[PDB]
Amino acid sequence: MLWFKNLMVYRLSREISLRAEEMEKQLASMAFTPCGSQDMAKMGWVPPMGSHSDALTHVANGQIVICARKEEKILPSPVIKQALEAKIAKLEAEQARKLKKTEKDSLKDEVLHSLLPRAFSRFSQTMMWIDTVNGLIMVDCASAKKAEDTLALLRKSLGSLPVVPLSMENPIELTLTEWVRSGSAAQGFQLLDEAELKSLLEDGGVIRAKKQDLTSEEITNHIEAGKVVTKLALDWQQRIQFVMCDDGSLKRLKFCDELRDQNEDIDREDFAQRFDADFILMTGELAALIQNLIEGLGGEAQ
């Protein structure tokens, strides 16, 4: 399998009509289909398991994983910009004076209808894990908008999907700054070597530190002047490193060799059982990180 690289977490508002044999059925109708030559972008469900399965969901232990594929046309803004000018300059190559607003909404779409068919595609695929035990959904993506596009896709397949982001009692920057300031992260977590420190004032001073000793007074000074820690590298139990972000997100997930290789003795042949072992392993482990991290950051606002 492919492990999460990044994480946006959501609380699902106290259950879904999740009958997984009708879940599969609802996702089936939004399975992925490729773009027609006038489509910009399509999106839809694919097998979390690959060519190796036809199933749109995988379930193991009240954990569901689902996969969203996106196809986007490679049509750069400078390419369209020139096509248009070339033709807007060609009227005028026989009597100048251009004009005007809803004129080159018609001209602009000739170029789009014209260029669109030849445009190549770019592919993206986002995995999404739903923990029915914790009532939480984890999206393997680096941006809020990408996680919101998959959630909307999901909520369209299923009708309603009331999620919110996790919101903490204490602000994150302020819990992060005190871990650095006191020289120790909350129980479970340890401080690595990478941080972002911002002044409280737009325009007052941003410090990005890498491969640096954080509990050192070089860093201390920054906090002591008014800066707050807005991104902190963390290691949980010798087993999972990540950047904690002040917006509640986890960037650049790294799983230790020992979890990655844990199931090395599975034939290298049955992909369905390798995915099965790896999935139960990843989700129990991220689940237990999340529970501990909520608590290290001082608890959810209730």
36 lines the binding site for a copy of itself (CB under 8 A):
no
41 lines the binding site for a copy of itself (CB under 8 A):
no
Is the Cα torsion angle 33, 39, 43, 49 positive or negative in sign? positive
| CA–CA separation, 163 and 137 (whole Å) | 8
**Partner residues linked to 69 by β-bridges:** 44, 125
215 touches, from a copy of itself, Ca ion, none (C-beta below 5 to 8 Å by class): Ca ion
To a copy of itself, the closest distance from the beta carbon of 3 in angstroms equals 21
Contacts by 35-38, CB closer than 8 A, 24 or more apart: 35/71, 35/73, 35/121, 37/116, 37/117, 38/113, 38/116, 38/117
Which stretch in 103-111, 213-221, 254-262, 294-302 sits in contact with a copy of itself by CB under 8 A? 213-221
Binding flags for a copy of itself, 275-294, as an x/- string (CB under 8 A): --------------------
| CA–CA separation, 286 and 127 (whole Å) | 14
State the distance between the two ends of the chain, measured CA to CA, in whole angstroms.
36
203 lines the binding site for a copy of itself (CB under 8 A):
yes
For residues 179-198, which are near a copy of itself according to CB under 8 A? 193
Which stretch in 23-31, 74-82, 134-142, 152-160 sits in contact with a copy of itself by CB under 8 A? 74-82
Between 106-115 and 77-92, two packed helices, what is the crossing angle to 10 degrees?
130
115 lines the binding site for a copy of itself (CB under 8 A):
yes
Name every residue whose Cβ is closer than 8 Å to that of residue 142 and which is 6 or more positions away in sequence.
Answer: 5, 6, 249, 251
DSSP per-residue letters across 64-78: EEEEEEEEEEE--HH
Nearer to Ca ion, 131 or 194 (CB): 194
Which of 232, 225, 217, 221 shows the shortest CA–CA distance to 200?
Answer: 225
Nearer to a copy of itself, 91 or 225 (CB): 225
Nearer to a copy of itself, 34 or 162 (CB): 34
Between 217-224 and 172-182, two packed helices, what is the crossing angle to 10 degrees?
140
Nearer to a copy of itself, 52 or 156 (CB): 52
93 lines the binding site for a copy of itself (CB under 8 A):
no
Phi, psi of 189 (to 5 degrees): -115, 150
97 touches, from Ca ion, a copy of itself, none (C-beta below 5 to 8 Å by class): none
How many amino acids of this chain bind a copy of itself (CB under 8 A)? 31
85 lines the binding site for a copy of itself (CB under 8 A):
no
199, 241, 263, 292: which one contacts a copy of itself (CB under 8 A)? Answer: 199
To a copy of itself, the closest distance from the beta carbon of 202 in angstroms equals 9
Residue 127 in 3-state DSSP? Answer: strand
112 lines the binding site for a copy of itself (CB under 8 A):
no
125, 132, 134, 212: which one contacts a copy of itself (CB under 8 A)? Answer: 212
247 lines the binding site for a copy of itself (CB under 8 A):
no
Nearer to a copy of itself, 80 or 256 (CB): 80
Which two tokens mark 220?
């201390």
Sequence letter at residue 248: G
Which two tokens mark 62?
């009240």
Binding-site ranges for a copy of itself (CB under 8 A): 74-76, 78-79, 115, 118-123, 193, 199, 203-213, 216-218, 221-222, 225
